[PDB]
Design a protein around this nucleic acid. Structure first.
Length: 1085
RNA sequence: GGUCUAGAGGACAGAAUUCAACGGGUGUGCCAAUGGCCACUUUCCAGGUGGCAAAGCCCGUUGAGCUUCGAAGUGGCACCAGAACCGGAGGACAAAGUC
DNA sequence: GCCGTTTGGACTTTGTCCTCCGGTTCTGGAACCACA
DNA sequence: TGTGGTTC
């Protein structure tokens, strides 16, 4: 309900090692206590425990079976009866096992599917289970917080709330289980950890009537928490595994019921390639099974195969596969699969049903995921070093061991933390102490915290650049943390210790006592994806109640109604456009009186959405220039040299193979061509590689096998030991190298927080991994060892690089939404200024389904991980909670392929750079300019500057503007996609207005396309309608309601095919003809 | 100034372009930002492990020298965390088949 | 023809190791009454 | 604004 934030603080423990040792001892004690109670709960559960399987990661073993638990549980219960001196009934084994299971389901209600409060369960049971004289859980004690009906009776009147206490107390089996434990001599079931032989700490003596310390209550709660969440996963994993088995059986008899002979044929196929595979021996059940990844682009190959003869030779089938791969090498599948599918014995898989293999690929993915799906969640006890939990500290006034944050205890910014209870270790003995004041290391992050009330040392103020008034906040719970790397170690040194303080920050809306900001009732956010929908009924009154008054920054959220759409990307991290809800009674802009761009709003005809500003929120390093382009090439010069040198080293190693026909085909690739025509290698190493080749050329065929192979391996050592020194010097220049470093603020940097700089680091890790695992023996596999770590310092740097990019991206988006701009003065040199009124809503693209998938090529998956847009989406929701900013998503299908102003479909294009058209020393063409010139054969055509090149992936969106051939509307692709999200917000857009999936069928005697009713919007418009044709390309609607489905497209602007419903294939070829076909024809002249 | 609208911090192209003392401090990190030496890992490179060492770092002041108008400038940025878990995919190695 | 993204290299199959990205389930309390 | 057992 309230924004919580963690500020990690470091403790200066240099001048007091007796307290540093006490904190470490306290950390070991709390982990040992949690492990004691967690182990007790696992025995009361008396079910199977599963652990991580060694000697192979994947499956899971049975660490402790149920009979082992029940046997060990009974050993403790019987020994406890003896320890309590029980003289009454001992109870049978089955009675004690049922009582223990009952108690477990009260401690962890998630075991049976119920809900449980970890705070209140641990408070309710620790004393009744560990205090010898406890009366809690029963109905005897008069203490405790008054019930909810007693609070109403005294103020706020009662009748129904006193009934709910009784009917809930009737179904409360706590009193009977505790009395059943008492009758069996188990009145103290477990032991208080601090008051037992397990702890060697000399704790403060127990008070009268005290048996449990505050430390034990911290331990017992953390044991219930980890137990509850794990039990919730046991139920969740079991359910999701059961749904998989149902998915498998509900799929065979619902997809290919009458297609049984094809299933037997593809099984022969999957085992045909299984035997004829020269790769590694198969071990998985689904090995060589037909997957969707291997069938990538099979739709194009099958249509091109249908236009052939079944008895035709291979090459015409094979060259028809090569053409599909050449069209785009990235979105292509397996050549060998299509090579075997062209064989006449397997042609029936794609000839009869052209969609069978993709259906069966889904069935194979269900088979593989079912073979790896777990049935139970692994159970791992806490460990002080391996799997640590952290000792908690309640705030001042809490019920646990508390702490105060001391502002300026030793200086201007020298803060301190006073632990009211702690441990102190002097000459090996651990001793509990009181009132320990510990200074804090300097933290500029702590400068955002200011004390609020002297009488209450919990209140604070919270600073923020995007808030003119500081937020009111309180200190919360804290936890003592140590570094994970300084944890498994022991040594004999005096280990940094941190305190992780939770800060609860109150937003400006929450400070006024409102559940939600007043503009929250205008925007409906649905689901976890925060799908945004506008209450068009209510925004006419909101503008009357909240008129624009010009207040900037965080002071203008209650005046006006603005929305900022964001288009995330890789070249530019964020592209934004701001719109304002205003009456159509407007006027001309300040500059040159050009009517402002606006969108109509559904429902309200008096109100529109006026465009305010559009910007590219480029993180540092996302710029480009002549000098920047050169430095970025030089920073990877030696790296790209060593990468290609390694590729030719492996070619030389294959020449030393024991397989005649491998070394001969490999030795052919070395002597047939020159070594480095592209000059990608270093000069000196290339010369050494040429010497060994010409040396082996004077021995090939002349010498014997075991004498030639011996020379090949000796020439590999000389060249590998040579390149080894090159890799050594390269790394020396990477860590210790003296490259220029920025001072102060500066735009146009080398890498900064750009995707390229992170991949510049990733490229170094990929090569070093390839360099260390490079094998000098041909055919040997070298993988990492079962627990090794590689490039620890570089890997942590790449992760810290992505973490810093993610947080700075979300902050830029929010600072812009709030209306703040970081501007330079050179007399102040950069300062956040409130320049614009704020936006109450940040509109993102709904991309929850754009996840990593095996169907996508591994490159496209790699980009999605570099991008990590879902991480940007979650970081925005976190940082926006304090600023009362709403973050919502919009249906993003075809957001970048349709015009935001016109509505006509378009093509992403690039413009020719002037480096390639200047007559004085022209630079070579890029990759996209070459592919475009090759497709249309424009070698003798002179390109000009800023020539549009339709590539389908550029940063410039081009759409036809009218029937005039060449009349184009050009705009930034990311900003067009950003404005499209805005246009869809105010019009209540649905994909059914542009795209429709249909199936053939009979309705009124003629063959027509029946549209698929997906969602209530599609059913509201096209349920009673149907589409007919005369040519098969342009469809028209009626009013009555092959085997594959047909997708219909529509131009809302009426420019392409007069906005009639068109088949998807011909529709986009018409868009291509009016853009690509025109630009190509004009270039030819 | 050329190109392109959204008319804005507009967008693409172009032309243009650091020491030294002393004092204080070193939360987690990034910005061209990945520490150094020695030893061990059979062997040289990579990677790992251990040890050692001084610091390297910022902030302030006083001096120097740079570089633009005697004055100014020689650092900026972001930060919601903890534990366990279940998934989703990458990376590397070898063989084979492919633009 | 491809929703969303768009890198120099791109693509598939087999097994086995290290890493990263995404999402779940718990958490980072409150308050009364006898104490001596 | 105590703690420690106890109830919400």
């Amino acid at each position: 309900s309230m924004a919580v934030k963690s500020i990690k603080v470091k403790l200066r423990l240099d001048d007091m090692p007796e307290i540093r040792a006490g904190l470490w001892k306290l950390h070991k004690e709390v982990n040992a206590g949690v492990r004691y109670y967690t182990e007790w709960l696992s025995l009361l559960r008396q079910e199977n425990l599963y652990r991580r399987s060694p000697n192979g990661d994947g499956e899971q073993e049975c660490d402790k079976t149920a009979e082992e638990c029940k046997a060990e549980l009974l050993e403790r219960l019987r020994a406890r009866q003896v320890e309590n001196g029980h003289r009454g009934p001992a109870g049978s084994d089955d009675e004690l096992l049922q009582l223990a299971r009952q108690l477990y389901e009260l401690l962890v209600p998630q075991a049976i599917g119920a809900k449980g409060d970890a705070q209140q369960i641990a408070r309710k049971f620790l004393s009744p289970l560990a205090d010898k004289d406890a009366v809690g859980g029963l109905g005897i004690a008069k203490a405790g917080n008054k019930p909810r009906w007693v609070r109403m009776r005294e103020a706020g009147e009662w009748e129904e709330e006193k009934e709910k206490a009784e009917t809930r107390k009737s179904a409360d089996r706590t009193a009977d289980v505790l009395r059943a434990l008492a009758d069996f001599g188990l009145k103290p079931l477990m032991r208080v950890y601090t008051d037992s032989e397990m702890s060697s700490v000399e704790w403060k003596p127990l008070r009268k009537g005290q048996a449990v310390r505050t430390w034990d209550r911290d331990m017992f709660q953390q044991a219930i928490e980890r137990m509850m969440s794990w039990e919730s996963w046991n139920q969740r994993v079991g359910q999701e595994y059961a749904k998989l088995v149902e998915q498998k059986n509900r799929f065979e008899q619902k997809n290919f019921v009458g297609q049984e002979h094809l299933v037997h044929l593809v099984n022969q196929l999957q085992q045909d390639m299984k035997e004829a595979s020269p790769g590694l021996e198969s071990k998985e059940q689904t090995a060589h099974y037909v997957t969707g990844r291997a069938l990538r682009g099979s739709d194009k190959v099958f249509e091109k195969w249908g236009k052939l003869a079944p008895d035709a030779p291979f090459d015409l089938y094979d060259a028809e596969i090569k053409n599909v791969q050449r069209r785009n090498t990235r979105r292509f599948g397996s050549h060998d699969l299509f090579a075997k599918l062209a064989e006449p014995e397997y042609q029936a898989l794609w000839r009869e049903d052209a969609s069978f293999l993709t259906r069966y690929a889904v069935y194979n993915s269900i088979l593989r995921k079912l073979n790896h799906a777990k049935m139970f969640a692994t159970f791992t006890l806490p460990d002080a070093t391996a799997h640590p939990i952290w000792t908690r500290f309640d705030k001042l006034g809490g019920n646990l061991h508390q702490y105060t944050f001391l502002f300026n205890e030793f200086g201007e910014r020298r803060h301190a933390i006073r632990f009211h209870k702690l441990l102190k270790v002097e000459n090996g003995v651990a001793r509990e102490v009181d009132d320990v004041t510990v200074p804090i290391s300097m933290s500029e992050q702590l400068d955002n915290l200011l004390p609020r009330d002297p009488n209450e040392p919990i209140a604070l103020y919270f600073r923020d650049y995007g808030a003119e008034q500081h937020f009111t906040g309180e200190f919360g719970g804290a936890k003592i943390q140590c570094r994970r790397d300084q944890l498994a170690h022991m040594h004999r040194r005096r280990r940094d210790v941190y305190l992780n303080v939770s800060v609860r920050v109150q937003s400006q809306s929450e400070a006024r006592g409102e559940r939600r900001p007043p503009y929250a009732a205008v925007f409906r956010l649905v689901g976890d994806n925060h799908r945004a929908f506008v209450h068009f009924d209510k925004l006419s009154d909101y503008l009357a109640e909240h008129p624009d008054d010009g207040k900037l920054g965080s002071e203008g959220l209650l005046s006006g109604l603005r929305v900022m759409s964001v288009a995330l990307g890789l070249r530019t991290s964020a592209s934004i456009s701001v719109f304002r809800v205003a009456r159509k009674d407007e006027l001309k802009p300040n500059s040159k009186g050009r009517v402002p761009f606006f969108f109509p709003i559904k429902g309200n005809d008096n109100l529109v959405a006026v465009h305010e500003r559009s910007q590219l929120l480029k993180l540092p390093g996302e710029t480009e220039s002549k000098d920047l382009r050169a430095i970025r090439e030089e920073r990877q010069r030696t790296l790209r040299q060593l990468r290609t040198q390694l590729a030719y080293l492996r070619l030389l190693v294959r020449c030393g193979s024991e397989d005649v026909g491998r070394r001969e085909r490999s030795w052919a690739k070395l002597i047939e061509q020159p070594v480095d025509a592209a000059n990608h290698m270093t000069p000196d190493w290339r010369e050494a590689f040429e010497n060994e080749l010409q040396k082996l050329k004077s021995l090939h065929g002349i010498c014997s096998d075991k004498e030639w192979m011996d020379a090949v391996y000796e020439s590999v050592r000389r060249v590998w030991r040579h390149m080894g020194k090159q890799v050594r010097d390269w790394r020396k220049d990477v860590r210790s190298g003296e490259r220029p470093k920025i001072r102060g603020y500066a735009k146009d940097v080398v890498g900064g927080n750009s995707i390229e700089q992170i991949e510049y680091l990733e490229r170094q890790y990929k090569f070093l991994k390839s360099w260390s695992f490079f094998g000098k023996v041909s055919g040997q596999v070298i993988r990492a060892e079962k627990g090794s770590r590689f490039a620890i310092t570089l890997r942590e740097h790449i992760d810290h690089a992505k973490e810093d990019r993610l947080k700075k991206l979300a902050d830029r988006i929010i600072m812009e939404a709030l209306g703040y701009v970081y501007a330079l003065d050179e007399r102040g040199k950069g300062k956040w200024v409130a320049k614009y009124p704020p936006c109450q809503l940040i509109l993102l693209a709904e991309l929850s389904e754009y996840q990593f998938n095996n169907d996508r090529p591994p490159s496209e998956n790699n980009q999605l991980m570099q991008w990590s847009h879902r991480g940007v989406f979650q970081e925005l929701i976190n940082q926006a909670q304090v600023h009362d900013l709403l973050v919502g998503t919009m249906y993003a299908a075809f957001s970048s392929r349709f015009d935001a102003r016109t509505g006509a479909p378009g093509i992403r294009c690039r413009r020719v750079p002037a480096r390639c058209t200047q007559e004085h020393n022209p630079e070579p063409f890029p990759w996209w300019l070459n592919k475009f010139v090759v497709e249309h054969t424009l070698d003798a055509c002179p390109l000009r500057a800023d020539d549009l090149i339709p590539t389908g992936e550029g940063e410039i969106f081009v759409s036809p503007f009218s029937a005039e051939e060449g009349d184009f509307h050009q705009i930034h692709a990311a900003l067009n996609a950003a404005q499209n999200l805005q246009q869809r917000l105010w019009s209540d857009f649905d994909i059914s207005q542009i795209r429709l999936r249909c199936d053939w069928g009979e309705v009124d005697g003629e063959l027509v396309l029946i549209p698929r009713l997906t969602g209530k919007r599609t059913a509201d418009s096209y349920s009673n309608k149907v589409f007919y044709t005369n040519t098969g390309v342009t469809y028209y609607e009626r009013e009555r309601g092959r085997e594959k489905s047909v997708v219909l497209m529509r131009d809302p602007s009426g420019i392409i095919n007069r906005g009639n419903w068109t088949r998807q294939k011909e529709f986009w070829s018409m868009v291509n003809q009016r853009i690509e076909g025109y630009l190509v024809k004009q270039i030819r002249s």
